[PDB]
Symmetry: D2
């Protein structure tokens, strides 16, 4: 599993559950092509987005649908999404964990990158 | 006046100076239209992006060009840029300050929405 | 002038107003001696804590009383307070701005060290 | 395991390994008594600090020795430590994960609290 997304709620001190996540990959014509998507689990994590084989070098965007998450909790947040844009595997395969920490008017995102 | 961007460097404990910032507005066909841009000052701030007249309700994206900032410092970064996407709302406070705190493998962004 | 504290609320996207802040200096017997204190202003800032003359090299602690802030808002918090401990250094820039970004179950703190 | 500490390096996008961690518990006379200590593993995590039985209600302080971590990497950071102070188990036993994200002039800390 070369790509994992983990989402935390800084208001409740909990995983952010059932958060929609969309991954895109930049095409040769510089447009964003759909790559993978899913929803975070009870642990706030989304596994199984891609495989080593599919996850080639490129520029990827992970869009985390934070607005819908907050609205379902009765909160009107500032951001539409949290977006994480990065070049992947440009020095060979790596394992990426994209973590996002959410508040209604602020988010943090951190990448933990390991060499298999 | 209605939109300010402030950028800080968490590695050096300093304003992030000479960071390119691009603002876009979402068009009717869901594309991103260039709206305003500039570079952060010696205080890490970018003022004068827009006017009350022009900054109407709609969806905006602020891209902060973090990769070029870290590359200039000789520090290997993760993200292509930091991306802040939000809906401007006339019902709320009149000033939007988008603050970004930068590290090579992590960034946070906070919206401070106030009435001058 | 040499020490400022700025506090922001990540839930409301606002300055954190009326937050108690206590500054201590480490004594020779390793105890914490009260040094200065105040409450954040309507801009979330606390100025005038100390003077260049008094702010000599040594170890300082800034405690930000976050629990009482969240309790006033009716929001259940995790931390008793946010605590920032550092050594003041004459070799470096002359102004220390301690910034704290607050959520109920998370806080960050950043030092911006500059020359006015 | 009711208490876990996890530490990440925001400069390298990696676990923070071999970081010293000291836990204290406030005594009846309002002094900080040593409670547990250890060092983070290769995964940046510290497990086994305490047991359900020992980890009674109280006010706890987790001190993470971040300065020594950065200095060993050749960096002179701002903070002496990252300190996390919280009341634990005051509504019955909980499981606490204390996470800290480190940069030379900034740190974040987040608590994830679960009901067993
Ligand atoms: C000018 C803005 C504040 O900008 N937001 C900041 C801000 C936001 C997130 C993390 C740190 C900071 C910070 C540090 C020093 C000075 C300002 C800020 C306001 O007061 O509304
Ligand atoms: C990528 C990380 C996964 O955990 N990352 C966390 C993580 C990352 C950024 C901010 C907070 C957290 C956090 C809080 C509680 C438990 C875990 C985390 C790893 O295992 O190395």
């Amino acid at each position: 599993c070369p790509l994992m997304v983990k989402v935390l709620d800084a208001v409740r001190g909990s995983p952010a559950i059932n958060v929609a996540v969309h991954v895109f990959r930049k095409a040769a014509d510089d447009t964003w092509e759909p790559f993978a998507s899913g929803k975070t689990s009870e642990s706030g994590e989304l596994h199984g987005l891609t495989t080593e084989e599919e996850f080639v070098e490129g520029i990827y965007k992970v869009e985390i649908d934070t607005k819908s998450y907050w609205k379902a909790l009765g909160i009107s947040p500032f951001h539409e999404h949290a977006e994480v844009v990065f070049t992947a595997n440009d020095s060979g395969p790596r394992r990426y964990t994209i973590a996002a920490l959410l508040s209604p008017y602020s988010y943090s995102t951190t990448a933990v990158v390991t060499n298999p």
